[PDB]
Structures are given as C-alpha cells and as structure tokens.
Ligand binder design. Structure first.
Ligand SMILES: Nc1ncnc2c1ncn2[C@@H]1O[C@H](COP(=O)(O)OP(=O)(O)O)[C@@H](O)[C@H]1O
Ligand code: BEF
Lengths: 445, 65, 32, 473
C-alpha cells in the first residue's frame, strides 16, 4: 500500500492546490513513476503532443484482456486530476494538465528547471563511514525508543511530539511511559521503505499553517537528490524543515551545504539471512541473527535467555506473550512475523511436509505451515484466555408497564445498534452507555 | 420505565460460577442475575476481579517453576 | 477393479478423521 | 570475557550473554554450540559432522530436547560419569569437543570435564562363594577403604547388606566402584550353552547399545533405556546368550513374567528344561547346573510374609550364587524397600531395563551407585521415521464442564472434587461418539481409566469388558 497511501493523500488535496503541486518538474517526475505501468504509457504519449485525443482512441490501445486494468488506470489518473476530461462537439475529449504537461516537458528536454533538482558544489564526502552510520544509528535510535529498550540519547521533541500526536506509540503522562500499539507493531513489520513513509505521511498530516505545497516540493525533491553530493542553499520553510528532516536521519548537515542520505534514495523505489530463527515444540527460540533490530523486536513477545555472537537463543513464555498481548499485539501479527521471517531450513522441511502431505493424498492442498501447528494453536488459545471475561458499560431497563413499550424501546435500540441483551420473559434489556442518551430521548418521545 | 447503571458481563457457566463465589465472599460484586450467560456487576470491582480471578485460575494451570 | 477397490478401502482405513484435517477452534465447541 | 563492550540489548540476557567469545572461521562446518555457563549444547542436525556428534553427545551429555532440526544436550557430572565408564578419558572428550565446537571451550568447562572423568576404574567389588570381597588392584587402597569411617592386590570382606552404604560412600570419596565381570575366565560358575537362533534380526540401534557395553570386552553394570515396545525384553536375551552363565530375571508383573519366558524361548535357543518360572501359580525351580529364574520384585523384595511354598524358592534363590541379574523396569528399584534386593542377592553383574528413567522424587540419580551409570538411550522420532515404530497423531480434547456439576466443584473438597469433574456427562457423549466413529474405521481402541468406579460405570453403560486389580488372571 506504498503508492496507495501516497496516492490517497494526493487525492484529498484540492484541485487548486494540486495545480500548484505540478509546477515543479521534480515532483512531476515522481508522480509520473507512481502510476501503474499502463497509465504511464498513456501519459508519456499525451505529454509531447499538443492535441486532444478522444477516450475511445485510448481504449483501442488496450487489449480485451487488459480492459479491467484500463478502468483502474483511468480512474486513478482522473482522480489525481492529471487527466482533464473535456467534452465538446459531442465527443469526450481528453487532455493533460497544462502545468503538469509543461513541467514534464521541461525536465525531459533539459530546459529551465528553476533549480528543482538543486545545485552541486563538488564537495563529495565518505558515505559508508559517516552517512550510513549516522542515519542508521539515528533511525535506530528512534526505534530503540519505540521498542522501549534503554538508550542514552533520546529523540528530539519534534519527532517525539509527532509520535504522541500520531496513533503510533501511544503514551500517557500518568503512566509516564511510552508503549507500542497495534499499528505500532505493524509499523515495525513494514519494510524500510514503507517504514519511512508512515512517519513521513503522519508528518504531512501533523503540519498545520510551512505551506502544504512547500512540504511536498521538498520531500519529493529529496528523492531526486543523490547521496554523497553537496547542494548549496532553498525555501525559508524548507530551512527549518531541513533541520527537522535532520532529526529523522534523512539529510546530514556538517553544521551552507546539505548532504542527502541513503534513506533519501530508498524513498523513491525499492532498494543465511539475518533475523531467521527456529521454533521448537518446547517453545524455544534460536535466532541466527547478529543485529540489535532483530533482537529488539524479538524481545517484544519472547523471553530471551542467552545470546551468542552469531545467534540469540530464547524461550517463549506465557508471561512474555501476555506482556506483548497487553500492549495490543494480535496473535495474527505475531505468527505473520514468524512465518515471513522463517529460516530456510524450516521452509525446506515445511515444503517436504507439504510434499509428503500431497504425496500421500494429492487430492487436497494443505496450507504450507513452516512452524509446528501446536505453537499456533497454543498462541491462539492464550489469546482466547485474555478474551474470556467480557464486560460492557451501560444501563439496565426494567419495570416496563406494558410489553408493547418494552418491545418498542428494545426494538428501537436494536435498530440503532446499541442493544446488548434482552429477555422477553423478564421484560428487561441492556444497552451500551453510548446509546443510553438516545434510548432515553426516544422513551420520552 | 426504569434505568439502572451498571456493567454487563458476558461469560460462560464456569466463569459465571467463579463470579458467584467472589460475589458470595463480597456481596457488592453481582447486582442481579440476568441469564446463564449474562451478569450485572459493580463497575468498581471490575478492575479487581479481573486480576484476582486470574490468580485463582493459575491453580488449574501448571506453570513449571 | 476389486483390487483397486480394496486399495481404495485400505487408503480410507488409514485416512485420519476430519477434525485432524483442520484446526477446529473457531467452530462451535463439542457437546450434545 | 575481556575487553568486550556490552550491547544496548545485553540487559535482556541476565549474566547469560555469550557474545564476549569469538567464533571460529570454520563455523559453517562445526555444528556445535556450547554454553559456557550452564553447559547447554545446541546441535545442528542439518550441517556436516552432525551424525558424528549425535552419538558422542548422547554418551557425555544427557538429551534435554531433540526436535527435528536443533537438538539440545547438556553436560553434567552424571552424564560425564556415564561416559568415563566406557573407556573414555578427559583427553578424548576435550579433543572431540574442541574439534566440533564452533566456539572455543571455556576454562570452566575444561575444569568440569577433568574432575569427573578420572574417577572411574580404581576400586572393584568382587563376589566369591556368596562372600563379598572389596578387591583392589593396588595395596595403597587399604589405607583408604579399611580406614574409612563407614567401611569396616589386598582383598578384604564386606557385609553383603552394607553394599548399598559403601557404594554411596564410594560416590562421596574420589574413587567410585565399577562392576566388571570377566565371564570368559570365570569357570567356577556353571556355564549355560544358549545362543540366538538364526531367525533373530538385531536392529541397528540394538547393536549400537551392545557395542557401547562390550566395547572394552568386559561386561559393565548399568542401565539401558529404549522406547516402549522397542524390545527391552530382547536386550536381556542377548546379554544372557553372550554371557552364557546362570541368570535371574526380575519383572514387575505377573502377566509380564509370562511374557518374558515366552520371549526368551522364542528368540534364543534356551531349552525348556533349563528354564524355570518363579511366580505365584507354580513354584518349581530348575535342578540343572545352570538355569534361568524369572520372577518379580515382590517375590524377591518381600521380607516379612513369605509362603512355605515360596520360602523354599527364596532359599533356593539365595543359596546359589547367580552370575547375572536382569532388572526389568529398573525405574522401581530405588524405592524404599526394593533397594534391599541389590544388597542381599549375590550377582557379579547387574543390568537395568526401563523405557522411562524418570520419576517424581529425586532418587533417580541414586541409580548411579545402585546398578551403575546409563549406558545408552535411543531417540523416539528417529525410530518413527525409519519405520521401527508407528507415527502418532497426538491430540488433546478440551471438554467444558457442565454448569450443574461445576457448581459443586467450588464447594467440594479436593478429594471428592476429582470424581466430580471426571464423570461429567459431556465426556460420556464424546467417548461414545469417538468409539463408534473409530470402530467403523477398523481401529482397535484402548480406553484407560485409573478410577475403578468410573471404569465399571463406563463399561456397564457401554457393555464392554473392563480390567482392574480384582480381576483373576
Ligand atoms: N528384533 C525384534 N524382532 C521382532 N520383534 C521384536 C524385536 N524386538 C522387539 N520385538 C517385539 O517388540 C514387542 C515389545 O517387546 P517388549 O520386550 O515387551 O518391549 P518393552 O519391554 O521395551 O516394552 C514384542 O512384540 C516383541 O516381539
Ligand atoms: F512396555 Be515396555 F516394557 F516399555
């Protein structure tokens, strides 16, 4: 949902503001890449020709097989307002946005760009030693704070304010601590690309009054910049944002020239294993990983017991699982992490198990379960234990003069979906606290 | 026409009996019996029964050391 | 055909029950 | 652990982080990880040298868990005491351990192996004409054994009953005793000419167990553990056939004793004339020079009330000097009174057979000085995948308690509570459905129930036979 999340945000932008967003070719080049392959084909056709083409001509290009894709492509292209539908002379003519059309032409033809891509000072620096370590550590520092593991340096208030204000990393002053949420665990599960977009996407929504267009001109322009290069100094709002981006480990500053980082290019497109582990029937964990990230995430729902240089060994316990569940982590997410981070040895034996299962009876195709079924059931069973006691808040209605009134009030609650329990024999029912006021008002009327 | 604020508890016979035993020891726990799968409980005691009941159930489950 | 039928019966005699095929947790609990 | 910076996540491991040590360049080949603190051993079963260590580890380290991929062993004093017995010195253990370990062996581990792998093989207990002599191969031991507060080429007598005391005492002192029998040069005891018939087919694991016992050439006293139904009975037959001397067998049941004789007869070439069964039914003993008596612990461990018919047999057993004793289900010998038999009866070698070597109390460890160390153990899954034993679809059915009964469960006491939730109606329904469903599948079902009252109620309700203590043979 990488492009979908970014595309969804662009749709809510007003058309008047969308036009301003297309002025800079740098943004246009990225917005052109995010569209589906078929959509990109048509855009490249219309950009260089100064004419209007009927939609029927576009349909002729697509084969009958790809008709469904032509509907998603046109719908997505029309949603962004990049494709302007003009109807005249009884024909629904189709044209591209002039600003987007002009912006794309300038970049591709090498025309004036208004420094959308920046400038070069030729003061290259070493990236692996400093840039990789700095951003990796800076991106790791926020993760250690997110995971809750102790670490001396804490992230700046700018990002910290964003985290609390965002659904990520729910906090309470009375508790005085920060804990991960259901979406927080999902955030940790997402790849680095999406893991960076989520925080940025939250940042886009957090910012208020720094112009909305200026923020996009900077973030998209950041991907265009190439790591290990210098760029002179930029908008006034971008200056404070540039410092703000420095807190996210995206841009490195020596203290006139700013240097992008590996994460900057990773934002545009994508790009034994570390983190792979073995799960036994004894609820033991043996991770063939040497990295704080894999160790830190495993400790969320695993009671670590010992570690080696190359691997880390631990044992799953009810207490550790209960601690993880208390934080809002669903068992489905836990198994997904284990399944998607399974050791090749488990996969090979699991494939053999599927082959053996199909070899004996090839009629049925049982699911490929890497880890023994008992672990999944017990983990799910532990989840059921937490959900054993179910309690609601509300009011109980009784002492009804007539059955008709009891049925009327009870039926009304059911219609509005606030009824939790009823009994015709006792003429009593219970409604949620949320619907209490609505039921009372109906009772009076 | 009469409303009574409270907490509606939905559970199984086994949990229902455990709540009754806690209600027997502490009268205020259960306010009224609704059905074999629903009980009315005092809101204040919810935060205490939930943690204490788990300790009672811990006897039925063997945790090795 | 009889031997094939006998083989089919032999395979059936060795097939595991249905509840072993799928994890029956979501389904209603066993009882009367 | 010198000049090793702790990691930010090192606090999660409480004095258990083992990242301070370095990994050898040949880690990709070496399959072993060694815990420098607890002695835990993690084994790679999908890497080279896995099979070469799967047997060595079992000798020096007891198996904690051995799942499909990664096996878990552990080195302990008892485990080392078992390996040192079968011609193994500290150098051999260290050399193989280092050659297979990805990480270097810590000094603490080396110290542990050295201490316990040097004790075996300096004091011998011998028996002659029903008289127990603690014979030693050097004269220096006299200043130790004769001067011990408990005890009392040089040989001195010792009380037969006090064997259980000195043997435990020998554990505390540096030198433990080893029971080795040179049956080849023992001509005083009448020999028995028996051998395994050609129809026998010794399974590979059976041969491995025998090799670990007869590797040096002298029979060693100890315990052999094999999976239930693996053929522990046949193990005793093979030992009797190779020793070729008078042997006595103790088995913990009346039916099982009847099983042993039939198995003896079928598997070996023991003539019926030389075989005698000492059970409650018949009490006639063999009169041949060498023979076999198969009895039970209750017939050898009982001390107060023995029958007149059973009193002569007990004297018959005690009078003669047996050459070999086979203790089937050796998990019952360390009991309060069964231990008395090992000190009373005379035997130059002792063997223990049991599928399970665990029990609720801590007396299991006492087996080391009672019968000897554990020689060999066999995996369960390994035999399952090789067709030696069947695969099992183990299941656990959760039957919710009915509302009516559960109400009494709260008020009722612990002793009566058991019967309350064991006879809930839901269990009756499930059992009937399962029995009918599995019966049509052509499967022979076994229903276990420790409660006799429930057994009769279930049996009479379903009209099926039931068996318990009162039923006649
Ligand atoms: N080598 C073998 N060949 C044939 N059957 C064997 C062999 N070893 C064991 N068995 C069979 O295994 C079964 C169980 O033997 P038993 O000695 O009672 O096992 P345990 O005492 O270990 O429970 C018997 O049916 C026996 O005949
Ligand atoms: F059933 Be056996 F004697 F383990």
């Amino acid at each position: 949902s990488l492009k979908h999340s970014v595309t969804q945000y662009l749709e809510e932008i007003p058309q008047q503001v969308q036009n301003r967003l297309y002025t800079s070719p740098a943004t246009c080049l990225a917005i052109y890449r995010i569209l589906p392959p078929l959509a990109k084909f048509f855009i490249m056709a219309m950009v260089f020709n100064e004419n209007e083409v009927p939609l029927l001509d576009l349909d002729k290009w697509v084969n009958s097989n790809g008709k469904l894709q032509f509907q998603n492509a046109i719908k997505s292209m029309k949603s962004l307002h990049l494709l302007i539908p003009n109807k005249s002379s009884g024909t629904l003519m189709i044209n591209l946005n002039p600003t987007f059309k002009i912006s794309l032409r300038n970049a591709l033809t090498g025309g004036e760009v208004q420094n959308s891509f920046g400038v070069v000072v030729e003061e290259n620096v070493v990236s692996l030693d400093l840039l990789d370590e700095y951003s990796a550590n800076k991106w790791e520092t926020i993760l250690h704070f997110m995971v809750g593991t102790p670490l001396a340096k804490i992230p700046s208030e700018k990002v910290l304010n964003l985290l609390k204000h965002s659904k990520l990393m729910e906090e309470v002053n009375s508790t005085g601590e920060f804990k991960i949420t259901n979406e927080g665990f999902q955030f940790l599960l997402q790849e680095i690309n999406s893991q960076l977009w989520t925080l940025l996407l939250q940042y886009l929504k957090m910012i208020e009054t720094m112009d909305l267009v200026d923020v996009l001109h900077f973030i998209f322009m950041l991907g265009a910049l190439e790591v290990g290069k210098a760029y002179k100094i930029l908008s006034e709002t971008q200056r404070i944002m540039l410092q703000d981006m420095r807190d996210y480990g995206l841009v490195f500053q020596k203290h006139s020239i700013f240097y992008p980082t590996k994460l900057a290019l990773m934002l545009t497109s994508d790009t034994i294993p570390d983190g792979s582990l073995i799960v036994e029937t004894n609820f033991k964990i043996y991770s063939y990983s040497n990295s704080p990230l894999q160790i830190a995430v495993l400790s969320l729902f695993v009671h670590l017991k010992a570690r080696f240089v190359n691997m880390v060994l631990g044992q799953i316990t009810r207490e550790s699982i209960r601690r993880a569940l208390t934080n809002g982590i669903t068992a489905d997410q836990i198994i997904a992490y284990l399944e998607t981070h399974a050791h090749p040895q488990m996969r090979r034996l699991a494939e053999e198990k599927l082959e053996k299962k199909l070899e004996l009876d090839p009629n049925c195709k049982e699911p490929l379960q890497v880890l023994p079924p008992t672990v999944v059931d017990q983990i799910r069973l532990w989840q059921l234990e937490l959900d054993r006691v179910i309690t609601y808040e509300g009011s109980l209605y009784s002492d009804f003069e007539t059955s008709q009134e009891y049925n009327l009030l009870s039926k009304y609650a059911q219609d509005i979906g606030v009824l939790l329990w009823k009994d015709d024999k006792k003429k009593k029912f219970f409604i949620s606290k949320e619907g209490n006021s609505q039921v009372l008002d109906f009772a009076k009327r | 026409a009469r409303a009574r604020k409270g907490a509606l508890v939905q559970c199984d016979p086994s949990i229902k009996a455990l709540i009754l035993q806690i209600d027997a020891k502490m009268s205020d726990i259960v306010l009224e019996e609704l059905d074999d799968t629903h009980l009315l409980v005092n809101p204040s005691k919810v935060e205490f029964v939930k943690h204490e009941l788990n300790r009672l159930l811990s006897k039925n489950i063997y945790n090795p050391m | 055909e009889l031997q094939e039928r006998q083989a089919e019966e032999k395979r059936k005699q060795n097939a595991v029950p249905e509840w072993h095929k799928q994890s029956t947790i979501g389904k209603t609990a066993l009882g009367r | 652990p010198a000049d090793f910076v702790p990691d930010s996540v090192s606090g999660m491991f409480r004095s258990h982080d083992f990242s301070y040590l370095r990994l050898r360049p040949d880690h990709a080949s070496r399959p072993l990880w060694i815990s420098p603190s607890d002695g835990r051993i993690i084994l790679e079963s999908f890497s080279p040298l896995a099979e070469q260590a799967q047997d060595f580890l079992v000798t020096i380290a007891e198996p904690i868990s051995r799942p499909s991929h990664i096996h878990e062993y552990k080195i302990t004093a008892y485990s080392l005491y078992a390996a040192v017995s079968v011609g193994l010195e500290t150098d051999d253990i260290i050399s193989v351990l280092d050659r297979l370990s990805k990480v270097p062996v810590a000094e603490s581990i080396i110290n542990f192996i050295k201490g316990a792998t040097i004790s075996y093989g300096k004091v011998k207990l011998v028996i002659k004409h029903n008289r127990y002599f603690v014979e030693t191969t050097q004269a220096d031991i006299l200043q130790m054994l004769l001067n011990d507060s408990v005890i009392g080429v040089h040989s001195f007598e010792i009380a037969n009953e006090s064997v259980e005391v000195v043997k435990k005492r020998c554990q505390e002192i540096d030198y433990p005793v080893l029971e080795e029998y040179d049956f080849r040069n023992d001509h005083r005891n009448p020999d028995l000419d028996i051998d395994l018939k050609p129809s026998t087919q010794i399974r590979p694991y059976q041969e491995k167990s025998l090799s670990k016992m007869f590797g040096n050439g002298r029979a060693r006293s100890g315990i052999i553990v094999l999976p239930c139904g693996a053929g522990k009975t046949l193990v005793g037959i093979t030992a009797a056939c190779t020793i070729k001397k008078s042997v006595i067998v103790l088995c913990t049941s009346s039916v099982s004793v009847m099983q042993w004789r039939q198995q003896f007869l079928q598997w070996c070439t023991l003539q019926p004339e030389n075989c005698a069964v000492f059970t409650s039914d018949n009490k006639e003993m063999f009169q041949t020079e060498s023979g076999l008596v198969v009895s039970t612990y209750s017939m050898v461990a009982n001390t107060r009330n023995r029958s007149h018919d059973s009193q002569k047999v007990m004297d018959f057993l005690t009078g003669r000097e047996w050459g070999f004793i086979i203790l089937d289900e050796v998990h019952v010998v360390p009991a309060a009174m069964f231990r008395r038999v090992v000190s009373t009866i005379a035997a130059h070698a002792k063997l223990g057979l049991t599928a399970t070597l665990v029990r609720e109390d801590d007396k299991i460890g006492d087996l080391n000085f009672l019968i000897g160390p554990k020689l060999y153990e066999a995996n369960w899954m390994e035999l399952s995948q090789k067709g030696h034993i069947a695969n099992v679809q183990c299941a656990e059915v959760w039957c919710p308690m009915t509302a009516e009964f559960y109400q009494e469960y709260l008020r009722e006491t612990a002793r009566k509570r058991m019967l309350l939730y064991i006879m809930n109606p839901t269990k009756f329904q499930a059992c009937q459905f399962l029995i009918q469903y599995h019966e049509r599948r052509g499967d022979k079902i076994i229903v276990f129930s420790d409660n006799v009252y429930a057994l009769q109620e279930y049996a009479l309700k379903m009209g099926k036979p039931f068996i318990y203590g009162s039923t006649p043979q």
